[PDB]
Design a protein around this ligand. Structure first.
Ligand SMILES: CCCCCCCCCCCCCCCCCC(=O)OC[C@H](COP(=O)([O-])OCC[N+](C)(C)C)OC(=O)CCCCCCCCCCCCCCCCC
Ligand SMILES: CCCCCCCCCCCCCCCCCC(=O)OC[C@H](COP(=O)([O-])OCC[N+](C)(C)C)OC(=O)CCCCCCCCCCCCCCCCC
Ligand SMILES: CCCCCCCCCCCCCCCCCC(=O)OC[C@H](COP(=O)([O-])OCC[N+](C)(C)C)OC(=O)CCCCCCCCCCCCCCCCC
Ligand SMILES: CCCCCCCCCCCCCCCCCC(=O)OC[C@H](COP(=O)(O)OCCN)OC(=O)CCCCCCCCCCCCCCCCC
Ligand SMILES: CCCCCCCCCCCCCCCCCC(=O)OC[C@H](COP(=O)(O)OCCN)OC(=O)CCCCCCCCCCCCCCCCC
Ligand SMILES: CCCCCCCCCCCCCCCCCC(=O)OC[C@H](COP(=O)(O)OCCN)OC(=O)CCCCCCCCCCCCCCCCC
Ligand SMILES: CCCCCCCCCCCCCCCCCC(=O)OC[C@H](COP(=O)(O)OCCN)OC(=O)CCCCCCCCCCCCCCCCC
Ligand SMILES: CCCCCCCCCCC1=C(C)C(=O)C(OC)=C(OC)C1=O
Ligand code: SF4
Ligand code: SF4
Ligand code: SF4
Lengths: 314, 156, 360, 176, 110, 70, 80, 97
């Protein structure tokens, strides 16, 4: 019965990642004054199915890897960590209702850089390894502002419990007291997922260009699971919805609409901006977001004390 | 028999999925690149057919040779074609890719890209219009639709 | 991260164009110029036509000159749309590419209505243009021009005040004026550095002394001022197109020397001299008097010139093609020193480089 | 007669400095760009439904070649080799002889469509309107030699497309 | 226990999809490929700057590890000392950032 | 036009709606028509194990009220 | 000192906002009338059992019942 | 409210193809459901439609026949299935069908 709950979590994750690709191609079509896919299915609804069947019977590139074992373990780790970030998500009830769900998510997203690192070293190209090291350095850079923005917000929560974050936002959204944290958080989640304007794995060859089309589709679907997940986590964190404990589907519809609009905001940002040069997003992290994030971390430490609004522990 | 029916339905499935998700690697060699970009432009929009805009060469399904193949770039074309995973296809766009074209008698031009790679669709024009190139891509999809891989495998 | 040396190896589209010109007549060698700067077709047609007409001691009729300047500025819009939108597509702004290629598609419809081909028209010929405008074309060019300023406005809304676009272009590819003159740069590559030089002002050709337009001058020599110069040249090209539509004269469109331009088919099928002239212009071709000219225009990439040598026959003895991309890509190595690997793609963008005219 | 792009010295009073700082911190031009992209989201796209909807053309359009006939069945081509003399790519190969009734007619009229540059110099060199470059652009092949047209293929293209070619010439011959 | 079941299910689904993606096109008998990089054969050049940003991540991440018990630390009854030491740790992270700034450590990956 | 993208958004939104609705209904099915007991702290687990012992049927969610005393 | 402020607010407004927010976070808890109430609320929160006192006979300020008048009251927290 | 007029136009596009069966027929063959004025039908079964309210490029279309010269063109529609007398009109070489 619990395994039914695990499958009703993880199989709709795979379906929503399948159709996020279609939604991205359609929304980027209409924002680029064209259509998206509308031939393959009715309104293109069979485009992800056709494309998945195409990729799973495409020939393997059959490369020379330094490690066979890390070449197998990098997609396994990417998919496993992409699926374990969902299990504490309170929507309105988490699958695993853990007391440190925020810190668990922060740790399991910190572990996601080994997929990039192991897949880069598993490729024998030195250029793929250099691009992998640039992607890892970008990601661990933006993890700093993830951790500190998240800490500064949870100073208003009182605990690392994700389910308490619904109770925190019953009177107001937490984007009202923490909109600078919210906007730096949103750009930091944009830079965690190698998402445009921070997609330097498509700027002129990434880390996973040496895989077959099947494992490349697995990396791709882990990345889009991370995108949908970080939008849901941002929605829980700043745009927390109303919850009737006798009608949980009201909260589910509300956070689902907000998370869809936030994922479409990711799609709409990649359809609007040029890329950063690599040192420019290093400049954006280390010289712009991190001083503001430390200043607001001091502010959200000292502000519940000066207003007498320290939240409860329990 | 029953196995004949199963390989017929499975060939129909895999051919549907391969033709309905063609990913092109376009060689922007010469003027035909501009008309490929018009076949990607919002009037014609290859992406509504599932034909994405600028897939990377290690994951592409068709190689659209759009422009003049000179002798100095013939091994680069061959190397990219060798790096493409199967089933790979090659569309020859325009007269210089087809038969050398206006530079057929030149000292420096490969007389048609068919001397270097096997070619599936020859799209004629100088340049062929973006509608004519889209016609050639739909004819390539019809060529993939009538492939008989598992049926010939079941008969071999 | 820094670029110490940039060595551009070219010749990957060297097709021996101007040796193939040496065996073909002047009419036969006209459509090679459509394919050199293959986003600027009728401008290169105009440069070759002006070279041949300068060597022939004839001149086009006034309506031919106004049609050539009209379609030269339509061509200038085509090339600056290609330039700005692919320069943004390579950096990452993929969306105004698709927004501007519909207006680009409508101008290719203008080419196809006037000649029959969407790109390589072979329409501007030595003597004038090949064929007159069809009825209703100038109304549709007016309906295009009435709306194209808003397309430039929304392109400029996307890119110009955007801080990410400014961070990719503001201190990148800075060329001093003295180095831009010494490296043989032309067009925007000069005018971005503050050099007040445009060939349609200084050495004017067909009716550019009769149209009124401004010349955008940059102030920092960077990728960003060259971007703003190309956007403002789209503005001023719309201005020239309005002045060409209002001041289009009546009259013939070929020179009325039937020993240079072919007669009409109605008189070719009726008159003996016109059939003889039609025969000899489409088999032998006209003879050009012996001499070497250097005729250059302000193409949308810069000074596009032809050093054309006739020996008296109906085929060129020599046809050297000066293109701006050759000198600009020779200056690529200087312009990328002290910059980064993602700045070199912005420098290859701000030099509007098409390798058909680079490699010939 | 010239203008200075980017020669604005920005105002340094507290109003304009606070405006630029609000633009930097509150990302006003980024929301402007998002608004323009959102404005295209709700426009109708420019995408026609090929193959069912076709791109607009004109009677001058230069597509697939065809040999034409008179309104009696007699072919117009009288073997004068002007089209292959003017042909800039030498796509046309012509051999001729007098046929059984003594008419000047071709026995070889080849057009290599993979040398052809589709510029239509042949149809304007032609003094009898025999060769035309017709309206068809959808004639892609699966094999290279299916684009090496002989006289039979060009005459069949003329018989196939004459009802359209004649009306396009009727639309355009007064400009010629 | 439910967490171990969930981790095992996620790992098993990931390993299953990886095995399917690595062995479903192996059933095809396509062809044997011979196929005889921007760098030609040159050794991987070390860059000091990537190592500096990785160590700067590690040091600020240790400072983050100190900062992580603050939502529980605000519940204390020694609030003046807690607030002083909290502002002092964020200030020392800021001073580490300023020293990394002003000695050109944040340059060419700024 | 722009409502052509809404079928894919509807499919993806139903797929995002499914896990929360599923875990709410499975928690109410597995816990006596009520929410799952949240035991983050050892006092809550202590009362929960007390409920499992005082229910008699080894299920904490079987509640016993005034009828279980005299 | 006023020209320096406008100069750095024109050049580096991120750092001006950073040092302004940091300076407010430093000085403002020592200026607020509510900082006393944070301590008062944290000591009013009963994590532990209130272990009773053996009544010796003379403790007039220790109640015998929770609803007795003597003892610490939290009407200040109910009102605020 | 003008959303109601939009939905009524969608319902009469369902009605305009002769109900849900012909509606889904043109939806899965044309990837397009809008109704037009039937300009004509050739000797093959290709049907030609106008809608001058559509923008220039959408305003003329063809619904290809399901069988032409022995071939089953139900799903395999082809741009070269258009006869030359309709090829002027469909490619907008003339105003005249
Ligand atoms: C979670 C829901 C959504 C949240 C909002 C996000 C939605 C909108 C997203 C739009 C698309 C963004 C795409 C990526 C853009 C990346 C570039 C970018 O923006 O860089 C950030 C830029 C970077 O600066 P820059 O690069 O533009 O400027 C140049 C920088 N120097 C000078 C160093 C060279 O700005 C920031 O870092 C600002 C971050 C937020 C700051 C919030 C400040 C709040 C107010 C403080 C007080 C101010 C008043 C004075 C004191 C008063 C005291 C009482
Ligand atoms: C859940 C997401 C989607 C999952 C994946 C999509 C579902 C369908 C997966 C199976 C697709 C069909 C079989 C693999 C592709 C066959 C294509 C192919 O190359 O066939 C020729 C291949 C090879 O045949 P061959 O002998 O002609 O080889 C061609 C190469 N030469 C001639 C040079 C040697 O056939 C097979 O591999 C047959 C294997 C069994 C077919 C399937 C059995 C039933 C499975 C259920
Ligand atoms: C530079 C150091 C700046 C901060 C110094 C300590 C500030 C503070 O609040 O101290 C009170 C705190 C705590 O005082 P307190 O008054 O909270 O103590 C009550 C006792 N407990 C905590 C058990 C309930 O520290 C001390 O009194 C002693 C430790 C710090 C002593 C000074 C170290 C100087 C190092 C120089 C090298
Ligand atoms: C949470 C919900 C998630 C939902 C996700 C999916 C959303 C979209 C679902 C699909 C919508 C309808 C798609 C219909 C496609 C067209 C099918 C069709 O008609 O194919 C015709 C083809 C050939 O037929 P033929 O007889 O030759 O035609 C000649 C007629 N004179 O015949 C064939 O090709 C053979 C028949 C193939 C039928 C395939 C139909 C679609 C399959 C979709 C699978 C997934 C559906 C969702 C599963 C979960 C919910 C149940
Ligand atoms: C190359 C190898 C393969 C790589 C791919 C697979 C591995 C990577 C992806 C999976 C990562 C596994 C993470 C396991 C622990 C996660 C942390 C954790 O347990 O947090 C949840 C929770 C803490 O919150 P709390 O509510 O306080 O505890 C319950 C008290 N009421 O704590 C609990 O609820 C406690 C539950 C019981 C304890 C669980 C212990 C799990 C088994 C040990 C680790 C197994 C994995 C080892 C390898 C890890 C990666 C290297
Ligand atoms: C014992 C018998 C069974 C044997 C095993 C078979 C397993 C089931 C396989 C699916 C059914 C078999 C038929 C497959 C399609 C063949 C028919 C076909 O392609 O018809 C063409 C038609 C569209 O026509 P077309 O010419 O492509 O369009 C031009 C544009 N007007 O195409 C259509 O209308 C759409 C066709 C859709 C194909 C089916 C739906 C997608 C696949 C669903 C099953 C696999 C899903 C796996 C999971 C994917 C990832 C979530
Ligand atoms: C006291 C409270 C706690 C204070 C400590 C914690 C603050 C939280 C934020 C931490 C920031 C850490 C890094 C700060 C480094 C500052 C030095 C610096 O960056 O100098 C160099 C810079 C010129 O920049 P450059 O060298 O070119 O670097 C590339 C970017 N252009 O030079 C500059 O940009 C000049 C910047 C310095 C002047 C800033 C003045 C701000 C005034 C705000 C209002 C008053 C605040 C009062 C607080 C004390 C101020 C000293
Ligand atoms: C368990 C398998 C589920 C299906 C596989 C993932 C969903 C399909 C995504 C297909 C896809 C699309 C559309 C796509 O556009 C794309 O290119 C950017 C991919 O990466 C290679 C993709 O993988
Ligand atoms: S076939 Fe002709 S128009 Fe096309 S790229 Fe070649 S030269 Fe240019
Ligand atoms: S269109 Fe031009 S290249 Fe083609 S056959 Fe005619 S003259 Fe020769
Ligand atoms: S097609 Fe015309 S130009 Fe060519 S040989 Fe025949 S009659 Fe002469």
């Amino acid at each position: 019965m619990f395994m039914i709950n695990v499958l009703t979590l993880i199989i709709p994750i795979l379906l929503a990642v399948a159709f996020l690709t279609l939604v991205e191609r359609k929304v980027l079509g209409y924002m680029q004054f064209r259509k998206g896919p509308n031939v393959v299915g009715p309104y293109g609804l069979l485009q992800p199915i056709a494309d998945a069947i195409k990729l799973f019977i495409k020939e393997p590139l059959r490369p020379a890897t330094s490690s066979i074992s890390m070449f197998i373990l990098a997609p396994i780790l990417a998919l496993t960590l992409a699926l374990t970030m969902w299990i504490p998500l309170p929507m309105p009830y988490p699958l695993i209702n853990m007391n440190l769900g925020v810190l668990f998510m922060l740790a399991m997203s910190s572990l996601a850089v080994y997929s990039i690192l192991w897949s880069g070293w598993a490729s024998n190209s030195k250029y793929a390894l250099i691009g992998a090291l640039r992607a890892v350095a970008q990601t661990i850079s933006y993890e700093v502002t993830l951790a500190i923005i998240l800490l500064s917000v949870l100073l208003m929560n009182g605990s690392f419990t994700l389910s308490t974050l619904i109770i925190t936002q019953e009177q107001v959204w937490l984007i009202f007291p923490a909109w600078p944290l919210a906007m730096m958080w949103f750009i930091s989640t944009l830079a965690e997922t190698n998402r445009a304007p921070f997609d330097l794995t498509e700027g002129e060859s990434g880390f996973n260009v040496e895989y077959a089309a099947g494992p490349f589709a697995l990396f791709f679907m882990a990345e889009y699971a991370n995108i949908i997940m970080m939008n849901i986590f941002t929605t829980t964190l700043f745009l927390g919805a109303f919850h009737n404990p006798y009608m949980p589907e009201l909260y589910t519809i509300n956070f689902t609409i907000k998370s869809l609009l936030l994922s479409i905001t990711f799609l709409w940002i990649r359809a609007s901006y040029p890329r950063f040069r690599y040192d420019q997003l290093m400049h954006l992290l280390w010289k712009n977001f991190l001083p503001l994030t430390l200043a607001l971390c001091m502010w959200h430490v000292s502000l519940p004390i000066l207003l007498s609004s320290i939240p409860p522990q329990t | 028999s029953r196995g004949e029916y199963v390989v017929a339905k499975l060939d129909d499935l895999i051919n549907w999925a391969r033709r309905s998700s063609l990913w092109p690697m376009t060689f922007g060699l010469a003027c035909c690149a501009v008309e490929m970009m018009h076949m990607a432009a919002p009037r014609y929009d290859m992406d509504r057919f599932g034909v994405v805009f600028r897939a990377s060469p290690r994951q592409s399904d068709v190689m659209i040779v759009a422009g003049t193949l000179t002798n100095k770039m013939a091994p680069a074309l061959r190397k990219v074609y060798d790096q493409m995973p199967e089933p790979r296809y090659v569309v020859s766009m325009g007269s210089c890719a087809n038969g050398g074209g206006y530079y057929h008698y030149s000292y420096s031009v490969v007389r048609g890209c068919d001397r270097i790679v096997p070619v599936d669709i020859y799209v004629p024009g100088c340049p062929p219009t973006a509608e004519a190139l889209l016609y050639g891509i739909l004819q390539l999809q019809k060529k993939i639709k009538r492939e008989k891989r598992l049926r010939i495998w079941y008969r071999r | 991260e820094m670029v110490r040396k940039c060595d551009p190896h070219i010749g990957l589209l060297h097709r021996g164009t101007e040796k193939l010109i040496e065996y073909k007549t002047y009419l036969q060698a006209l459509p090679y110029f459509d394919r050199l700067d293959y986003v600027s077709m009728m401008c290169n047609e105009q440069a070759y036509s002006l070279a041949v007409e300068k060597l022939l001691n004839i001149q086009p009729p006034p309506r031919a000159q106004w049609i050539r300047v009209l379609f030269g500025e339509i061509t200038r819009l085509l090339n600056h749309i290609m330039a700005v939108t692919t320069h943004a597509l390579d950096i990452g702004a993929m969306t105004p590419f698709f927004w501007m290629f519909e207006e680009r598609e409508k101008m290719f419809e203008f080419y196809e209505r006037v000649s029959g081909a969407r790109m390589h028209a072979a329409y501007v010929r030595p003597g004038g243009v090949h064929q007159d405008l069809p009825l209703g074309l100038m109304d549709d060019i007016y309906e295009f021009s009435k709306n194209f300023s808003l397309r430039i406005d929304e392109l400029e809304e996307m890119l110009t005040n955007n801080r990410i676009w400014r961070n990719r272009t503001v201190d990148i590819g800075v060329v001093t004026a003295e180095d831009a003159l010494n490296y043989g740069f032309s067009g925007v590559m000069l005018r971005g550095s503050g050099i007040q030089w445009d060939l349609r002002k200084t050495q004017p050709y067909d009716v550019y002394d009769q149209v009124e337009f401004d010349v955008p001058i940059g102030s920092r020599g960077d990728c960003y001022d060259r971007y703003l110069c190309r956007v403002e040249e789209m503005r001023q090209s719309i201005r020239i197109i309005s002045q060409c539509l209002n001041k289009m004269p009546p009259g013939e469109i070929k020179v009325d020397d039937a020993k240079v331009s072919p007669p009409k088919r109605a008189e070719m099928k009726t008159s003996m001299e016109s059939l003889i002239h039609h025969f000899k212009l489409y088999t032998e071709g006209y003879q050009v008097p012996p001499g070497a000219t250097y005729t250059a225009i302000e193409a949308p990439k810069g000074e596009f010139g032809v050093y054309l040598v006739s020996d008296g026959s109906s085929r060129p003895y020599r046809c050297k093609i000066k293109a701006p991309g050759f000198a600009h890509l020779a200056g690529l190595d200087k312009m990328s020193k002290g910059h980064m690997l993602a700045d070199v793609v912005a420098i290859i963008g701000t030099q509007d480089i098409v390798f058909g005219e680079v490699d010939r | 007669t010239y203008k200075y792009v980017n020669l604005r010295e920005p105002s340094m009073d507290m109003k304009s400095v606070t405006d630029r700082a609000a633009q930097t911190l509150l990302w006003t031009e980024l929301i402007r760009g998002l608004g323009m992209t959102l404005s295209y989201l709700f426009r109708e796209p420019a995408t026609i439904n090929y193959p069912f909807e076709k791109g607009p053309l004109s009677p001058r359009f230069r597509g697939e070649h065809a040999l034409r006939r008179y309104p009696s069945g007699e072919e117009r081509c009288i073997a004068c080799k002007l089209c292959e003399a003017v042909c800039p790519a030498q796509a046309i190969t012509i051999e001729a002889e007098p046929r059984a009734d003594g008419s000047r007619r071709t026995t070889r009229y080849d057009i290599d469509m993979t040398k052809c540059i589709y510029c239509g110099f042949c149809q304007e060199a032609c003094p009898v309107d025999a060769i035309v470059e017709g309206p068809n652009f959808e004639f892609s092949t699966e094999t290279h030699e299916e684009l090496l047209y002989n006289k039979e293929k060009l005459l069949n293209n003329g018989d196939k497309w004459e009802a359209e070619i004649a009306a396009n010439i009727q639309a355009d011959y007064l400009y010629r | 226990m439910n967490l171990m079941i969930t981790l095992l299910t996620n790992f098993t689904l990931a390993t299953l999809l990886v095995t399917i993606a690595f062995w479903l096109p192996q059933l095809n008998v396509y062809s044997e490929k011979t196929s005889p990089d921007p760098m030609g054969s040159a050794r991987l050049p070390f860059s000091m700057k990537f190592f500096l940003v990785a160590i700067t991540f590690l040091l600020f991440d240790l400072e983050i590890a100190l900062l992580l018990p603050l939502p529980w630390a605000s519940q204390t009854t020694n609030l003046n000392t807690m607030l002083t030491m909290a502002l002092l740790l964020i200030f020392l992270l800021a001073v580490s950032l300023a020293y990394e700034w002003t000695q050109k450590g944040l340059e060419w990956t700024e | 036009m722009w409502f052509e993208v809404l079928p894919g958004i509807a499919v993806m939104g139903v797929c995002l709606f499914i896990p929360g609705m599923a875990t709410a209904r499975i928690h109410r099915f597995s816990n006596g028509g009520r929410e799952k007991r949240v035991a983050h702290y050892s006092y809550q687990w202590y009362l929960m194990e007390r409920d499992r012992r005082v229910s008699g049927v080894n299920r904490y969610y079987v509640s016993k009220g005034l009828e279980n005393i005299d | 000192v006023a020209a320096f402020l406008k100069n750095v607010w024109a050049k580096e407004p991120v750092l001006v906002a950073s040092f302004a927010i940091a300076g407010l976070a430093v000085i403002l808890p020592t200026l607020s009338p509510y900082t006393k109430y944070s301590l008062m609320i944290n000591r009013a929160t009963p994590y532990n059992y209130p272990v009773p006192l053996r009544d010796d006979g003379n403790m007039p300020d220790v109640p015998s019942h929770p609803q007795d008048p003597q003892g610490p009251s939290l009407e200040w927290l109910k009102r605020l | 409210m003008e959303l109601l007029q939009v939905l009524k136009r969608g319902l009469q596009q369902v009605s305009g193809h002769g109900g849900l069966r012909g509606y889904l027929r043109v939806l899965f063959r044309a990837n397009d459901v809008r109704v037009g004025t039937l300009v004509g039908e050739d000797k093959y079964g290709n049907k030609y439609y106008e809608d001058n309210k559509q923008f220039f490029g959408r305003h003329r279309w063809v619904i290809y026949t399901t069988e032409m010269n022995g071939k089953n063109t139900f799903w395999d529609v082809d741009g070269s299935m258009v006869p030359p007398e309709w090829h002027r009109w469909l490619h907008c070489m003339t105003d005249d069908p």
